Subunit: 262 residues, 2 copies
Amino acid sequence: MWITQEITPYLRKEYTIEAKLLDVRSEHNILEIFKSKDFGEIAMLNRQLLFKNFLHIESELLAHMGGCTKKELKEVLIVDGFDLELAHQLFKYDTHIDFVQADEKILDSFISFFPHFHEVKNNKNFTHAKQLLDLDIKKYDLIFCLQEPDIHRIDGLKRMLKEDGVFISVAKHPLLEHVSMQNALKNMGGVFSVAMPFVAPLRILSNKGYIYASFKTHPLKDLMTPKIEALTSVRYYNEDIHRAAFALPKNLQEVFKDNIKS
Amino acid sequence: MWITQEITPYLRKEYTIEAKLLDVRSEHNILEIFKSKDFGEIAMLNRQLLFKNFLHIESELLAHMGGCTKKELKEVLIVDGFDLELAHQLFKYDTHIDFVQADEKILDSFISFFPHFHEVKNNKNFTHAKQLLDLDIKKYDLIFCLQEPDIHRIDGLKRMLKEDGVFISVAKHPLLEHVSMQNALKNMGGVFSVAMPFVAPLRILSNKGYIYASFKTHPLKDLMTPKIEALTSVRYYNEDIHRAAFALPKNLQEVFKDNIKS
């Protein structure tokens, strides 16, 4: 049989699967993993897809987008997601990771899906909490919002960031849905002096975009190549990719021109 | 009512459509056009999809890729396709275009689809031909092969490109089909001292790739922004887009190591 991915209400992708391997459901989440000849495994998390054999792309891009634009990363914060692969890539920097997910049952359900699952959980500097109000008070050098945040969430994380911090969050694809990306940028602008959209170059099977927001640190100006060339075992990330990620066509630069803070 | 498009044998895209608007078929080609709530109209030519509201995307990228990487282009050749928009964007340069396509009945079927159809066909510098032999023997500054050319096709066109001329052609997306692209680059390398792959940034709806080839002319080094900043009628193409199109993930740089000529 097969499952379907939603890119637009008038455009869907259909993935053929070998068999369903797992089905975990909690109070506010539903997880299903399927056997796949194209990607090995496909996890459907609340009308959302994860492709095992390609988990390295997004995890590397977001991790290093921040880690190579900053000097030191001592405290990083990740919220509203189950992406432990991101944490693994972040552990290629001397840093502590406060990971927040209220649904332990689901996060652990990814035990054999995230290749670096035990490695990340075994980390002495990896702290899992069900809620932000479980953590100790501190500011973060980097915060990752794995889910498009509303104006509320935005303001609540902007306050836990450091003056020289960077906040990376998710949005929609800027070309496919420039309107939505425009609204994403508008929110972000209200509190940051830097708000620029980027995508994962070469990733063609997903309507997804992201934002690099800060109080001063620029994603290109502050780009540091020595921290890039020092990364070990990455298979997607590199400086070419970094810079290409922010490339915007003439039209979109124009439509977004009053929403982009560089 | 929908129309499907294959990415892989286990991965398809489904585009809901309002209705069928046209259905033209020749002995070797099949063209149907549909009304689309998303793209105005989509044209399905031999299972290749075209989007009326975004034709400027590829036509701008391909036409100005070679256009802005070369001091002067007076002779351009386009073969194996029906993209008359590429021709349009090319007429933004003082140049002549030899368009070769043996199937006039389906070519003329785009009379309403291609916004600039009429303006390109009646251009005093546009010459349509059913086959290469029917042309005035000459060397070109630019050669566009709108289809992935076999070795035989390659050698032929190769012998018609000028000293500093350039050859841009199509291939598969290296993300899901790196092997294919690796061969395409292999066929292009044995004959050119420059063979580089590139894609269309932000075009998440295309499993299509390209190859930029030449005897020396370089797509990055020989890029002239004065020519780029001279186009005031483009909506997508610019220098950021030009450079980013060539960025590749680290793993593909390694695999393509023995075929890419820079």
